[PDB]
Amino acid sequence: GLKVPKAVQKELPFKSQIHQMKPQKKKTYMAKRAVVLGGDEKKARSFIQKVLTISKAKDSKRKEQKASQRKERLKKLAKMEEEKSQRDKEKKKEYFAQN
């Protein structure tokens, strides 16, 4: 990742300051308090995670494949438009050369 230096980032403007939060080293009370459920609930959590990452990776595959589709459609479309514009700028000169 982009590692901006501390000498630069302490002297940044107020809008451009980089919100970098430090890791937690103390076993805080809310984290040592909070309960997680087990068995059927942890396999429900595992299942929902697997379903959501399969959905997200399928969507990323689909949109990358659409990007690869539409760049080559852009290429052939620009070739056909260039041929068309060449035909127009010679037909206009024909028209005016006759009239």
Binding site: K43, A44, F47, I48, K50, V51, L52, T53, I54, S55, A57, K58
Partner: protein
């Protein structure tokens, strides 16, 4: 209320991500954010025709999630697809980088 949305909050995620539950189903592209007013309901198959759509007393469940978890072919597909997505996503990130460095270091 939010107290009931925190009970049906998982099968609404399943209906939102329908498209990646079966590899052969392939829905039409909608978005389907959670509607403001909904109701969770159970299908009554009547007592006229048997054995075709009939899900018996011994396998009726209480969410869509328990049915999808009880399906063992879907569990095969989800575990397999998740492991291949996992090993694609960790392809060259950090364990690869430090084993390349240890390859340099070993000799």
């Amino acid at each position: 209320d939010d107290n009931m949305r925190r009970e049906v909050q998982r099968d609404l995620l399943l209906i939102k991500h329908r498209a990646a539950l079966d590899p052969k189903r392939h829905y039409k592209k909608q978005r389907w954010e959670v509607p403001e007013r909904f109701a969770i309901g159970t299908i009554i198959e009547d007592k006229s025709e048997f054995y075709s759509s009939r899900m018996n007393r011994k396998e009726r469940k209480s969410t869509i999630l328990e049915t999808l978890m009880g399906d063992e072919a879907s569990n095969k597909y989800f575990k397999r697809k998740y492991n291949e997505i996992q090993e694609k996503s960790t392809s060259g990130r950090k364990a690869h980088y430090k084993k390349m460095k240890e390859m340099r270091k070993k000799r």
